[PDB]
């Protein structure tokens, strides 16, 4: 039975009913995809920084 195949009518209206949402950026993004050699170092740099700050504060 012949009929309508595809249309993008009403899709932008439905898209903008509940708005088009920007992805809500955060401080401290996830390290997913960042270089593993950087990540392994950065874990230790953070651990040493927190160790030195606790030693300087106590």
């Amino acid at each position: 039975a012949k009929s309508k195949n595809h249309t993008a009518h009403n899709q932008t209206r439905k898209a903008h009913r509940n708005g088009i949402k920007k992805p809500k950026t955060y401080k401290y993004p996830s390290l997913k995809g960042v270089d593993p050699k950087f990540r392994r170092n950065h874990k230790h740099a953070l651990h040493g920084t927190a160790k030195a700050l606790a030693a300087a504060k106590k």
């Binding site: 009913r17 949402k21 992805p23 995809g33 270089d35």
Partner: protein
């Protein structure tokens, strides 16, 4: 049959920009990309490894990852009724810095300098950009500039 491949409808757009074919000049490789740098995506069609998709050309994103020959760029992509974050592993032949951000940081330096100068004085600075304000009052002189123009022209044909 419908064709929807990875480089479909990319005939003129990965094309190599008449009389600028050939090798990639060395400043492309000599630029330095850091995490948080905002970069424009324009795919070099001569370099086939690490090409972005045809969606991502023209798009501007923030570098999140820096690797040996590539950078990772976050592009927000409108998918349906929301945006999604797209992490892109693009070799640095398809990436250049964003001059909008370059002049923004020169504006930040200029704003800091003007606020420091206004703190050297005691006066306010008013350091926001303002739009094109309407023009102020003028006195257009006529000396050497007598207003002289005639009417519309007749219809001649000159075929």
């Amino acid at each position: 049959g419908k064709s929807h491949g990875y480089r479909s409808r990319t005939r003129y757009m990965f094309q190599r920009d008449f009389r600028k074919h050939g090798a990639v000049h060395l400043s492309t490789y000599l630029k330095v990309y850091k995490v948080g740098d905002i970069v424009d995506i324009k795919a070099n069609g001569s370099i086939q490894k690490g090409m972005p998709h045809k969606f991502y050309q023209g798009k501007t994103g923030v570098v999140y990852n820096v690797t040996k020959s590539s950078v990772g760029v976050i592009i927000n992509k409108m998918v349906g009724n929301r945006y999604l974050e797209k992490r892109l592993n693009l070799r640095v032949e398809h990436i250049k810095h964003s001059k909008c951000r370059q002049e923004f940081l020169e504006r930040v330096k200029a704003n800091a300098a003007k606020r420091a100068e206004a703190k050297a004085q005691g006066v306010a600075v008013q350091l926001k950009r303002q739009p094109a304000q309407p023009r102020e009052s003028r006195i257009v002189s006529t000396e050497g500039n007598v207003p002289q123009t005639l009417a519309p022209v007749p219809y001649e044909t000159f075929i």
